[PDB]
Each structure stands twice: as structure tokens, then as C-alpha cells.
Amino acid sequence: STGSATTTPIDSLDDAYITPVQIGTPAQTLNLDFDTGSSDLWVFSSETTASEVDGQTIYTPSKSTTAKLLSGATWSISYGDGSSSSGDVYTDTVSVGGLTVTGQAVESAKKVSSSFTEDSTIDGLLGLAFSTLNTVSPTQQKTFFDNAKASLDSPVFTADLGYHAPGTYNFGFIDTTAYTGSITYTAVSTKQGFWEWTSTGYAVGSGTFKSTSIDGIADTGTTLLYLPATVVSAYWAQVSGAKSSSSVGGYVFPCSATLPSFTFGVGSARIVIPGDYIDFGPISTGSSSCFGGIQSSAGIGINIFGDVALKAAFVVFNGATTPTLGFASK
Ligand SMILES: c1cc(CNc2ccc3c(c2)OCCO3)ccn1
Numbered sequence: 001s002t003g004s005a006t007t008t009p010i011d012s013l014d015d016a017y018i019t020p021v022q023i024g025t026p027a028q029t030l031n032l033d034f035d036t037g038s039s040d041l042w043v044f045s046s047e048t049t050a051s052e053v054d055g056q057t058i059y060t061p062s063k064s065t066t067a068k069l070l071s072g073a074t075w076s077i078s079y080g081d082g083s084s085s086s087g088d089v090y091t092d093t094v095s096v097g098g099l100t101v102t103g104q105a106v107e108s109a110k111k112v113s114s115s116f117t118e119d120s121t122i123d124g125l126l127g128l129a130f131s132t133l134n135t136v137s138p139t140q141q142k143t144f145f146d147n148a149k150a151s152l153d154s155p156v157f158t159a160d161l162g163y164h165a166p167g168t169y170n171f172g173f174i175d176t177t178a179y180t181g182s183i184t185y186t187a188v189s190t191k192q193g194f195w196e197w198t199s200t201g202y203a204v205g206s207g208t209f210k211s212t213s214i215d216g217i218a219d220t221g222t223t224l225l226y227l228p229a230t231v232v233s234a235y236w237a238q239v240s241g242a243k244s245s246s247s248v249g250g251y252v253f254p255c256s257a258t259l260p261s262f263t264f265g266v267g268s269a270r271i272v273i274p275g276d277y278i279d280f281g282p283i284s285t286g287s288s289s290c291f292g293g294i295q296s297s298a299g300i301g302i303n304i305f306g307d308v309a310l311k312a313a314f315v316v317f318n319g320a321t322t323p324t325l326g327f328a329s330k
Contacts, residue, residue, distance in 0.1 A: 197216070
């Protein structure tokens with residue numbers, strides 16, 4: 001089997017992407033944030049504290065003839081930005097782009113943090129990291145991909161995120177029309193539960209490539225590119241007036257600037273992130289100070305190849321017995 005679904009930016013900055021997901025019988029379609037940096041599929045629901053729901057579409061398990069309470073199971077998750085959610089668990093039928101999994105754990109939120117409430121466009125998360133990170137207790141549950149993979153034509157999914165435009169998540173096949181040149185595959189460590197790999201270096205604009213190993217994660221659920229402070233300083237030094245602002249929480253730059261590209265290495269291959277991809281717009285409405293899309297990972301403890309990087313590539317998440325990652329230009 002295969003599946004193919006369009007993923008759409010939630011706003012004009014590509015702050016996140018949402019993908020429609022069918023849950024239950026009859027189908028209830030929710031728009032979920034596909035997140036290769038976590039492993040829980042959770043949704044706003046009829047169980048979510050009423051004051052914490054503000055415009056989201058909810059899953060109502062009592063209206064699904066295939067929903068079953070997973071007795072005694074609870075979940076609770078925190079993300080790197082300090083947001084969180086928790087609740088109980090159902091199993092139900094979940095379909096993405098025509099690919100169906102029966103008995104998928106659907107984690108129903110009883111509580112969500114304010115940031116979720118305040119974002120009407122995201123109805124929940126669909127985790128695509130390794131199932132070892134799943135938070136369900138006392139019986140850990142499998143991701144949608146983990147459940148689907150034996151049925152897939154090939155045990156892979158691909159992320160093809162758009163810049164200020166829709167893109168595609170495919171399951172079970174590689175669309176050879178969706179990229180240019182060849183896909184370069186690179187080793188993955190699953191030891192921390194992530195799609196963790198080592199980039200071979202970087203360049204800033206038309207500058208020379210610096211060969212250096214940068215261990216980090218491919219994370220569709222993180223907006224920005226978080227890299228070591230040395231690398232980030234070298235990038236922003238090429239933008240007149242750019243500076244790190246403790247009050248804003250990262251590098252800012254004059255909105256009048258033209259940003260240089262940023263290249264990252266995948267083996268001997270190179271992925272080029274155009275300068276425009278690194279502009280996250282005014283820090284507050286009407287400001288002439290703009291927020292940068294490349295930020296330091298120093299306070300995080302891990303480097304993160306988030307959407308800013310991934311959207312510049314066609315990315316293969318290869319879930320073979322020994323997982324690997326592939327990157328192609330597009
Ligand atoms: C997974 C989940 C989260 C939760 N926080 C979050 C999720 C989506 C967002 C977001 C914030 O802020 C910008 C809009 O999209 C953050 C990172 N990885």
C-alpha cells in the first residue's frame with residue numbers, strides 16, 4: 001500500500017504545516033502537524049477542557065463506531081518550546097492520503113497548554129519519530145508509520161515541504177518526479193529516538209564550504225534551523241546590522257536586508273537554503289526588525305534541522321531494519 005497527502009503552511013511565514021487526517025468511522029477529518037521529532041498522535045477532542053478549545057476541530061470518539069477506549073492508558077507530553085498536552089487514549093481507524101491503519105492509538109487531549117489553544121489551525125500532532133519516544137503509559141504505543149510499515153510497498157515516508165506553498169507527505173514510495181539529481185543517503189542513530197544524523201558541514205552564501213561534523217535531527221515539527229553558535233555567528237556576520245537579541249530571544253536583522261543563502265552538507269552532496277527561507281518577518285507587527293530563521297542550538301542541547309532546512313530538500317525517512325535518511329535537491 002501507499003498514501004499521499006498534501007501538507008499546507010498554517011500562515012504566511014511557514015510557521016508549521018498541517019495535513020488532513022481521517023479518524024474514525026464515519027471519518028472525522030482533523031488537520032494535524034506531522035512531526036518527525038516526536039512519537040505521539042494526539043488530538044483536540046470532545047474530552048478537551050472546554051475553555052482550552054478555541055476554533056480547533058475536535059475528535060469525538062463517541063461518534064466513531066470503530067473507537068475503543070484503551071483502558072487505563074494515559075499520556076502526557078512536553079515539547080522543546082515549553083508547550084504541553086495530556087489525556088487518555090483510544091484506538092481507532094486512521095487514514096492519511098488513502099493509507100489506512102486500524103487500531104491506531106489516538107491520544108485524546110484532556111488538557112492543552114495555552115499556545116495550543118491560541119492556535120486555531122492545528123488540531124493535534126502526528127508523531128513520526130521512533131516509537132520508543134511515545135509517552136503512553138503503562139503500555140507504550142506505536143506511531144502511525146510504525147503500524148503501517150509492514151503493509152507499505154517500501155518501508156519509507158518522504159517529506160516535501162513547500163516554501164510559502166503546499167507540499168507533500170508520501171508513505172510507501174519515492175516519487176522520482178519530485179526532486180532533481182540523486183538522493184544522497186546518510187546514516188541515522190536511533191539511540192535518542194530521533195532521525196538523528198551528521199551533516200558534513202556548511203557554507204554561507206557564496207563562501208567556501210567548511211567541512212565539519214554537525215550531529216542533529218531531521219525535525220518537521222520544528223520551524224527553524226538550530227545549529228551550533230559558531231556556525232550561526234558566521235552566518236549572521238554576513239548580514240549588516242544583524243545581532244543576537246536576548247530580549248527577542250535570538251538573532252534579528254534589519255528587514256531591509258537581503259539575506260545570503262545557507263548550504264548544508266549531506267555526505268558529499270550539498271543542500272542550498274535560499275536566503276528568503278531564512279526570513280521570519282517582523283518581530284512584532286510594524287517593526288523593521290525581522291526574526292532570523294537560523295538560530296543557535298546552544299540553549300537546547302541538540303542541533304535541529306527544522307522546516308527551514310527540510311523545505312529546501314526532498315527528504316526520505318527510510319524505516320528499513322537499519323534506518324537511514326536521504327536528501328535531494330528539488
Ligand atoms: C512539536 C510540537 C510543538 C508544539 N508547539 C508548537 C507547534 C506548532 C507551532 C508552534 C508551536 O508555534 C508556531 C506555529 O506552529 C513544537 C515543536 N515540536
